[PDB]
Amino acid sequence: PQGFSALEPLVDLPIGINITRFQTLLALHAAYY
Amino acid sequence: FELLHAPATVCGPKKSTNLVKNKCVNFNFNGLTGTGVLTESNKKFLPFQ
């Protein structure tokens, strides 16, 4: 919706890996943006 | 001893002295360092600040 709201941090990780991809792990038994 | 890219998760023990108020102090807060007078206040902080 055309409103406003801010976003707060949750989880900082020092994992430090080299990411160049992205995916989603969803159940299979109304969508995303 | 192994040190490759991120040596910021296995450190030695950290000390923490007592605190005083209403008097000039040379403080060191979480790495933030300065001189001033630490007096309790009222300003409100959001849990991540």
Curated annotation (Swiss-Prot), chain B:
Chain residue ranges for the region called Disordered: 5-27
Domain of life: Viruses
Protein purpose: Attaches the virion to the cell membrane by interacting with host receptor, initiating the infection. The major receptor is host ACE2. When S2/S2' has been cleaved, binding to the receptor triggers direct fusion at the cell membrane. When S2/S2' has not been cleaved, binding to the receptor results in internalization of the virus by endocytosis using host TFRC and GRM2 and leading to fusion of the virion membrane with the host endosomal membrane. Alternatively, may use NRP1/NRP2 and integrin as entry receptors.
Subunit record text: Binds to host ACE2. RBD also interacts with the N-linked glycan on 'Asn-90' of ACE2. Cleavage of S generates a polybasic C-terminal sequence on S1 that binds to host Neuropilin-1 (NRP1) and Neuropilin-2 (NRP2) receptors. Interacts with host integrin alpha-5/beta-1 (ITGA5:ITGB1) and with ACE2 in complex with integrin alpha-5/beta-1 (ITGA5:ITGB1). May interact via cytoplasmic c-terminus with M protein. May interact (via N-terminus) with host bilirubin and biliverdin, thereby preventing antibody binding to the SARS-CoV-2 spike NTD via an allosteric mechanism.
Protein name according to UniProt: Spike protein S1
Organism: Severe acute respiratory syndrome coronavirus 2
Span covered, complete protein: 515 to 563 of 1273
